[PDB]
Design a protein around this ligand. Structure first.
Ligand code: SF4
Lengths: 289, 289
């Protein structure tokens, strides 16, 4: 029973680092896993392969002329734990849709049969900075049924998480696509552990894990490797193991309930990241009030 | 001579705040300016209109059934300095392309003739987090000829800036679309003033302004207004005036020269934001080295 998963979330909060460390812990569970990277920069596999940047299907279809002129040897690599690694590649900037890099990539892996081969998990590392039909490709073409959203106690991350949810909603009533939970990637904001459980409930799922911000994640990272690989005996290593536990063992897959902007500011004001408004000074000069 | 401009750049570095403050100083120059907001959240006009969030063409085409059922009174507002303000609106999450909200909006303004009416400047606030053909709509349909990119001394902002540039390149040899310069929105990183001039040269333009990070921008902002409007006698107000000067007076419009990733890490390592690599430890456990 090979399960199809995707890790969606906003950029710059270290989504990929957690995707890769989660996956590394699952290979330590003895699960064969394949990461399909879907970002324009090739950052979705570089901790598993010890790479500066893995070569992408777009760059190499450009070398060969078309996609059929490519063989799986150099498209799909494997590293720590025989974790298979593809990078889809980015759209030609300013002209292509991002989504077509990702279909080109899934189609190329269905055809050279990497999907029905021995695998336990597929994980698509997808950006959530814009929730358009471009980035919703693995949702719409029913390639990822289990979506876990990475966020933090901060507006844009949570905004992203809600919008990803609205998309799961449209496609839920014509497929197996469900939200399996949220993951807080700590930004050391005061009581964000709580904030993301609050959000996870008003959406109808759980906060399946709180990932703290250790120092070792950064020290393993400058070595182009995971914390599971660098120091298995650290606190943080156990954090990812525990997340990878919960993901196998999870059966709480839902069709979420998106909130409003007003409701979202509630959550941010209540837990104190957002400042409680004063319209008694809105629109007034330095001098007036 | 009404000039068509776009402000492209990565999110979360306060692009919109500088777009709106720049435009506010131009209304103080006595220029009629229209901001066309292109982001899925309505944050491109809210400092000019003192608004929580301006209503968007997408939400209101949804009310009325189609776009023709809308009149310019409530689509296009005006605030501080008779600065016209439209918000394009976002794609239905997970299904539409972002680009079609922006064509639907420019087409609606061409037809109800807001473009040939008395105007000096048009400014499209466009996201740069993904440089796909979706967000390159104002470039491809030759609606913005002068593109000024906002960035900072940090990897992703610079990456964004280069990618926007690759886009200007593809569309330059079939239109008047040019890069008029970069703008560093300081993040108080040590010597980023320098870094962005270095980048602006290896690309072939200029760093047309350095915008510092004042405290007053934040205090004007919680009042839903610009610094030009809140305290004209601050240092920061003068900063935006100087930028708005340079933009009118600018005639250095180019077809840029994108650099590589390697060249980009050069610039980051040279000015000290990026750490000088050691591959003598890449791939080694805590224990080995
Ligand atoms: S659908 Fe999204 S990724 Fe595709 S071209 Fe449009 S905005 Fe870009």
């Amino acid at each position: 029973a090979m399960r199809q998963c995707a890790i969606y979330g906003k950029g710059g909060i270290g989504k990929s680092t957690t995707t890769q460390n989660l996956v590394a812990a699952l290979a330590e569970m003895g699960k064969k896993v394949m990461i399909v990277g879907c970002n324009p920069k090739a950052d979705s596999t570089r901790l598993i392969l010890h790479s500066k940047a893995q070569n992408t299907i777009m760059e190499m279809a450009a070398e060969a002329g078309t996609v059929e002129d490519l063989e799986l040897e150099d498209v799909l690599k494997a590293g720590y734990g025989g974790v298979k690694c593809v990078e889809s590649g980015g759209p030609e900037p300013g002209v292509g849709c991002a989504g077509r890099g990702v279909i080109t990539a899934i189609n190329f892996l269905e055809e050279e049969g990497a999907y029905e081969d021995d695998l336990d998990f597929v994980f698509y590392d997808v950006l959530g900075d814009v929730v358009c039909g471009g980035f919703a490709m693995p949702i719409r073409e029913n390639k990822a049924q289990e979506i876990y959203i990475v966020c933090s106690g901060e507006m844009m991350a949570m905004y992203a998480a809600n919008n990803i949810s609205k998309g799961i909603v449209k496609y839920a009533n014509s497929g197996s696509v469900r939200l399996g939970g949220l993951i807080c990637n700590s930004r050391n904001t005061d009581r964000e552990d709580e904030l993301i459980i609050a959000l996870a409930n008003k959406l109808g799922t759980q906060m399946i894990h709180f990932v703290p911000r250790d120092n070792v994640v950064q020290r393993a990272e400058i070595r182009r490797m995971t914390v599971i690989e660098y120091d298995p005996k650290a606190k943080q290593a156990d954090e990812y193991r525990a997340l990878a536990r919960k993901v196998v063992d999870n059966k709480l897959l839902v069709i979420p309930n998106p909130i409003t902007m007003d409701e979202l500011e509630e959550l941010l004001m209540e837990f104190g990241i957002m400042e409680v408004e004063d319209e008694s000074i809105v629109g007034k000069t330095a001098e007036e009030v």
